Amino acid sequence: MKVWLVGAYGIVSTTAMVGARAIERGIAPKIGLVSELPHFEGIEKYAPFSFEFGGHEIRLLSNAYEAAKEHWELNRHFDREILEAVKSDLEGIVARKGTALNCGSGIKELGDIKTLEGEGLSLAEMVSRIEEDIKSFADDETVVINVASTEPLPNYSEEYHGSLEGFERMIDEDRKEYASASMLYAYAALKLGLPYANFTPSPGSAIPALKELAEKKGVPHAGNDGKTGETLVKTTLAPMFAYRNMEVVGWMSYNILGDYDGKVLSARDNKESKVLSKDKVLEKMLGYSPYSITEIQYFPSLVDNKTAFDFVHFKGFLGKLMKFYFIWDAIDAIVAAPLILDIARFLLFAKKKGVKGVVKEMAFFFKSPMDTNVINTHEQFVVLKEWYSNLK
Amino acid sequence: MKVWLVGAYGIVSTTAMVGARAIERGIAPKIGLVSELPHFEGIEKYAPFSFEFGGHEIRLLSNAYEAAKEHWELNRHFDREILEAVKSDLEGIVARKGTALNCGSGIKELGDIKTLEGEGLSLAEMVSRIEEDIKSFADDETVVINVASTEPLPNYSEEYHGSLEGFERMIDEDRKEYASASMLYAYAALKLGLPYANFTPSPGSAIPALKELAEKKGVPHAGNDGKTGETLVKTTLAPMFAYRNMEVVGWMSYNILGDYDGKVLSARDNKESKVLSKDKVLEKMLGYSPYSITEIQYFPSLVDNKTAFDFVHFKGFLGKLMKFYFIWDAIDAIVAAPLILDIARFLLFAKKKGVKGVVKEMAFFFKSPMDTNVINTHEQFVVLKEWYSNLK
Amino acid sequence: MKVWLVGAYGIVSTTAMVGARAIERGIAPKIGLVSELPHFEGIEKYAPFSFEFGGHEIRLLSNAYEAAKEHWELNRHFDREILEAVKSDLEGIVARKGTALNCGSGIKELGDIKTLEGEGLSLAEMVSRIEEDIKSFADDETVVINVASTEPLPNYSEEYHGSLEGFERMIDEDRKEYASASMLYAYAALKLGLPYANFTPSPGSAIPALKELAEKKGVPHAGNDGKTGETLVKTTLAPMFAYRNMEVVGWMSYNILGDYDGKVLSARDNKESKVLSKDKVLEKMLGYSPYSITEIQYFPSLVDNKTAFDFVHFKGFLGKLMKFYFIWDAIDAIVAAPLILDIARFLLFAKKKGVKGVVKEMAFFFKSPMDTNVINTHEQFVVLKEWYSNLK
Amino acid sequence: MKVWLVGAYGIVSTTAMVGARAIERGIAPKIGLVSELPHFEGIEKYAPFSFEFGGHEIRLLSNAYEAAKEHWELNRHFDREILEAVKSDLEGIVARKGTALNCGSGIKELGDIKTLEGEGLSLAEMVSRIEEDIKSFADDETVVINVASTEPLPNYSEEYHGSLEGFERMIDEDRKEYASASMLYAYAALKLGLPYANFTPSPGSAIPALKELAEKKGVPHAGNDGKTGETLVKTTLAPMFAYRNMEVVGWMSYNILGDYDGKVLSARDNKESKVLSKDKVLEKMLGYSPYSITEIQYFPSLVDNKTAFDFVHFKGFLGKLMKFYFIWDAIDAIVAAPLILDIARFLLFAKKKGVKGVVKEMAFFFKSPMDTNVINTHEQFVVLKEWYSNLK
Ligand SMILES: NC(=O)C1=CN([C@@H]2O[C@H](COP(=O)(O)OP(=O)(O)OC[C@H]3O[C@@H](n4cnc5c(N)ncnc54)[C@H](O)[C@@H]3O)[C@@H](O)[C@H]2O)C=CC1
Ligand SMILES: NC(=O)C1=CN([C@@H]2O[C@H](COP(=O)(O)OP(=O)(O)OC[C@H]3O[C@@H](n4cnc5c(N)ncnc54)[C@H](O)[C@@H]3O)[C@@H](O)[C@H]2O)C=CC1
Ligand SMILES: NC(=O)C1=CN([C@@H]2O[C@H](COP(=O)(O)OP(=O)(O)OC[C@H]3O[C@@H](n4cnc5c(N)ncnc54)[C@H](O)[C@@H]3O)[C@@H](O)[C@H]2O)C=CC1
Ligand SMILES: NC(=O)C1=CN([C@@H]2O[C@H](COP(=O)(O)OP(=O)(O)OC[C@H]3O[C@@H](n4cnc5c(N)ncnc54)[C@H](O)[C@@H]3O)[C@@H](O)[C@H]2O)C=CC1
Ligand SMILES: O=C(COP(=O)(O)O)[C@@H](O)[C@H](O)[C@H](O)C(O)O
Ligand SMILES: O=C(COP(=O)(O)O)[C@@H](O)[C@H](O)[C@H](O)C(O)O
Ligand SMILES: O=C(COP(=O)(O)O)[C@@H](O)[C@H](O)[C@H](O)C(O)O
Ligand SMILES: O=C(COP(=O)(O)O)[C@@H](O)[C@H](O)[C@H](O)C(O)O
Ligand code: NA
Ligand code: NA
């Protein structure tokens, strides 16, 4: 199959590229891959473990191997012998110039970038480069996945976002003020009839205009925002307190990381998309809102080794309060990269099975799942198991 | 309804007594009570929030109020104004002299005790005092719940434990070597046709002899071992790692507490029942055994404020290892006492609905659930919800 | 002796009042009191354990007992029987109306307040009420200690703060823009010849104008900012890494609390004084600056039970990095209140021994010690021991 | 200089070998080396950074490079490029066959071993091989350092250990029952006039017989037991509580590690030396004994990445209790290896400066310092600074 990756040279994207190839050459286990659990046997009939990559980037380096080695140099999150083995394959992967349109102040923190909007292109001219890049790569087994730096909350507009006819009116009128890059790549992929997922809290295809386009074109799509570590624990453990009829009176979630993700998120406008996504799950699960605080801070020594400190204060019998603390220490790229490969395969499955529009049953992968109030990790895992069985 | 409590003067038992009454007088919330969740509406038709207490003890103090105040003095785990309000009610609760038969070396740590076996009674003569105590209290809405100090692993015997006819042959032959107190109280309650639950890792009714008696007499029973804090988190979080296709390579669980429970468990023979119960859940959920360590140590300054430190080392994509840590800080009596009241009400429900034998669907309350391989907290909560709906 | 307390109805101030009296009535141990360590035997010759209180407040409640009970109701940080025992004594303590001049936006969070500036008084008229209040209370064994809500960083001015003649020119010209309440109370106390300490990161007497006045008047003074929990651990543990020739590459300090202190500090202008004070100690001890982050967030369920999460990332032999984590769980009022009593006694000692100006050797009590680069807790404790011996 | 290392192929020993050479070839920083702090400038006049190695082992592998690579393969605690750079140097280091005489049951856990006692040699014949090995290597700038697996507590004997004349009577009588390997290597080194340090809690030279021999021969010696991580924090932080007049009511120290050290310590007899050494520091610093628990457990996934969980429960003002928690995550070999090089250089310094007998002023390096009640890390660091200045 083919995966077009937005933000192709990022750490999640390149680790997924590295892992795909290492697994295919026989030199790495299949750990981490949900699509490889026993419940999903038979998936290889529809979406075999077999990948070619392309993508869009704004940080142009020469190819995906150079990009993979840069992140590896700082992180050493897989073995040198893997990097060497997949070098040749990755050196053949060369990203194309994307758009950082309205992606917030945090993009400054990436250093040397080049973008389509920086060439003076109108929105319509931009959309055409993007589509030309994707379609020249795409086949009948291609999916597009956004792994780009998180954008800030967009300037929402009813006219331009609330219908597909209004969204295309935006493009025709070149009204950039209301377009963000994640929407343009989503639009390009759905217009081309490719399945799409959004791994980030950017809006992507999560506006009605693009949901309406997905249904009309008969294309499945999924999102938003990879739920990979601290928020995974949150949607696993919060349920325990409800099962036992306990009130959660406060939940603190404090995250510190470095590398390119922590750097963009060091900016206040970019940080807000991610924080809101992480914060808001509590109410949806419990029915009420405990005093929550969720923060992300840059901490460069940690590089991609994001660490999360959480504290949960909660009331039990007779009203007495009590305390639970947890600390999560993981490489972000390691818990996210297999999910990119899972999402790609499940999208292809859903595509081959006639599924259109939001695949709400992929909520399990995401912090902010489209079209569903199923947040609980256990329930999400049941829904995804059952969804697959119903279509298999 | 009536609850006969084995270990009536313990902290869990007295906190439950205090809480029952405080709730009934209107001065405490219903937090902590599973049986008060919205899914279980209508339960009050079969098991209203309404309790009278009695029980067996070996530490004879004058009454349940003196016993409640002693634990309160050290713990202050509810307000003085609650203690004052429920004083009169508790002063009417007076335990009867039980048996500490073969309850292990740790019983020395309780100080001044008096027991039936210490009076020279045969097993048959013991069983008769126990039954006479219980039946003089019991009505058609009575349940017996074991909350006594944890016993060591028993000397298991096929003849004497593997059939009801062999168990009664033990009693007739006065073969004490093979009887433990928890089995004698279980036997007494089931012989009398009362529902029984075991809140501790002692054997209780979890031997075939007594399971066979429960079916024959048509009595429901449940157990074993309240799953209340660290093991609750364990059966909630371990699933997350399986959902994501991660290998758990080691799990450490280190617990330190004081008061009467930590004191009995300071003994190596008594400690083993509890440790095995806490340890063994991992395999049952995951399919394989990570390197696990589970310890309990006395730490007197903590009194009933058991604190648990856990560390989970686990492999993800590409085999890279990663770390999760958690610390649990709660009053044991506070997370256990509402469950005693829940178990009592659910037993009465099950009784009134024609249920006999092990109520496997009460696994949610227990670390070592009888007759079931459902360990996962989420699944256990679904089974209990569904069980109730099917009988309501 | 007498202690005039600025912020008399706060939690630290009232807990110190409660504790003083409980100790004097014989019903509480002397734990927590540095001045009661064996090295300081003989101090009772100069500063016996014997206290009368008065003070300034802007939250006017009826008396110090009402104020003590309000904090106790939420915190229960000492026993009911103590509160009852010291009730009569505290009911005789009635604060006088102070000034919240330029104390930042966070003062809104205290609710109902009344202030001298709110009466239209000029600076000179304000200074006169303050001095009249203090002098009508003061004797030859009186000290004034600021325990008021933390102010923001002041508008610093060379003319008005850099000399005593320029500071009094400010008062004569009624130039409020450049005066903050903490400076006015410091000025009032030093003008009256009373020793002064500042327990907060407000400026207080830490401007040259007031240091010059302290020397001229021959009055000892100390500050700034009680070092009581997380920053105490910081100045104790950071040294370990230097002793062992390790580079600290990052130190995160994340604090969450509620009650009146967390509420005022929830405001960004007020928060900054405290954060800078907590943050800046690292460089002073180590010689260089690790990447540090220090945050304070409101978390109301915790009330005065401030909890601190810290993480220290550090390099060792061969450059390999490594991790230390700590979590501090304490009642702020409990670790601060005995130090108020210690500071008062040590000030009186220093006064009776002819000491004038900044008592730099009291650095041990403070996060931002005036006139000293001795930050290390061990060194600070040696300096204070030696200082006392040299004057005893 | 030369360092003879007992347990030459262990992880601490080989990491120190690797580091020495990497530093000398210019490719690693001097971080971790106390002897490289600015206070110790001029030490290179007496003990330059310049090392040749030899040693005794019972696990015979071909040479020190093979041994270094085995630990590296599991731990990756320095870079591959370092291992490659120092390969040739280490391949020239070949250990000689030592003695595991009375080293406890845990030695079984090392797998394939060969020993002098296994050849049938008497004690006197053993002592002669050891001395012949050491003296054929030794020069006027040689030191012997024990880094061997921890032994159990020895069978102490007044006759055979309480005097040098009684110790040699043991050797003459071939009374093995009373000799342990660590004493034999200590004896061999001091008889040969070499300085000796003991990095482990084995007895080594810490018996009067050998202390008396050190004085008589005029040889300096130091020990016992590298204080490197959790116990370093303990002797740094415990003082804070005394400085502030707080009672420590309980301290739990729970350690889990794997590799060869955790494996030997998995045995109950070997574990006890280390646990007692770690536990007993509290009383010596504070004056009294808090309820302490100190445990070490094998946890193989962690290899040499020992992790320590500690909890400190302590009383403050008014008697209110409060909690501090810490977690230490470090590679044991990384915090210990530079200290071997420091100890060697400081021993040579002390030797060249006429120092004889126990160098009590090296207590800073050790958990159980000989001939001193100075336990506090700060005081220990002052003593070592001052000692060096006095002799420089
Ligand atoms: N555990 C994880 O790593 C999870 C990551 N995320 C999100 O996934 C995304 C990727 O994470 P990382 O790889 O760690 O960050 P990264 O910064 O290393 O990778 C993002 C890449 O996208 C490129 N990029 C940014 N904006 C672009 C645009 N508009 N068009 C084309 N390329 C663009 C950047 O040059 C960079 O190479 C981030 O947005 C992050 O918030 C979401 C949940 C969890
Ligand atoms: N969170 C919790 O508190 C949980 C508790 N458990 C178990 O529940 C039991 C009760 O816990 P606590 O109330 O904390 O302990 P506790 O020691 O305060 O209460 C037990 C009481 O039972 C009495 N007793 C002991 N053996 C007896 C016997 N053979 N016959 C009659 N009375 C006897 C003792 O005198 C004592 O009053 C313990 O076995 C504990 O292991 C199980 C899971 C969790
Ligand atoms: N561990 C601790 O509790 C430490 C506290 N601090 C500082 O000590 C101070 C006292 O702490 P808490 O008692 O917890 O806070 P609190 O808010 O309960 O007490 C402060 C009191 O001062 C009053 N106040 C505020 N501004 C005033 C003014 N300008 N004039 C007169 N009264 C005024 C308020 O009405 C309040 O009653 C805070 O500034 C805090 O930052 C410093 C280090 C540590
Ligand atoms: N942070 C640390 O690594 C600290 C280590 N220690 C002690 O330092 C010692 C070394 O630690 P590691 O290198 O981690 O362990 P390791 O087991 O990898 O190294 C010990 C080596 O000594 C050899 N050995 C054992 N007994 C011997 C004997 N009687 N004669 C000659 N060789 C013998 C073994 O074959 C092994 O190669 C251990 O005793 C440990 O308890 C003490 C404090 C801290
Ligand atoms: O999106 C998330 C959060 O997902 P979670 O790890 O909370 O499940 C992460 O990628 C995020 O960028 C940082 O790791 C976090 O420290 O802010
Ligand atoms: O039975 C348990 C364990 O249940 P868990 O809190 O692990 O779910 C507790 O009652 C036990 O006695 C101690 O709290 C534990 O420290 O040993
Ligand atoms: O001044 C300090 C800090 O002193 P430290 O406890 O850091 O030694 C505290 O009073 C502060 O107000 C909060 O507790 C902290 O969470 O911001
Ligand atoms: O000797 C010690 C303890 O020194 P500490 O790290 O406590 O300062 C260590 O080498 C020990 O072998 C283990 O790391 C510990 O987990 O038992
Ligand atoms: Na860690
Ligand atoms: Na806590």
Side-chain angles (χ1 to χ4, degrees), chain A residues 211 214-215 219-223 355-361 370-371:
Chain A
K211 288 188 192 189
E215 291 287 346
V219 176
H221 65 128
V355 190
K356 79 184 155 185
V358 167
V359 192
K360 75 181 182 149
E361 296 92 349
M370 290 186 299
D371 283 24

Side-chain angles (χ1 to χ4, degrees), chain A residues 336-376:
Chain A
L339 306 186
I340 300 300
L341 304 189
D342 295 327
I343 293 161
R345 292 168 87 201
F346 275 121
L347 283 184
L348 190 61
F349 178 73
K351 184 201 142 146
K352 283 174 178 182
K353 287 293 175 166
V355 190
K356 79 184 155 185
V358 167
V359 192
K360 75 181 182 149
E361 296 92 349
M362 287 174 63
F364 177 72
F365 294 99
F366 298 116
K367 279 199 205 51
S368 285
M370 290 186 299
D371 283 24
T372 183
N373 285 300
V374 182
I375 302 303
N376 186 324

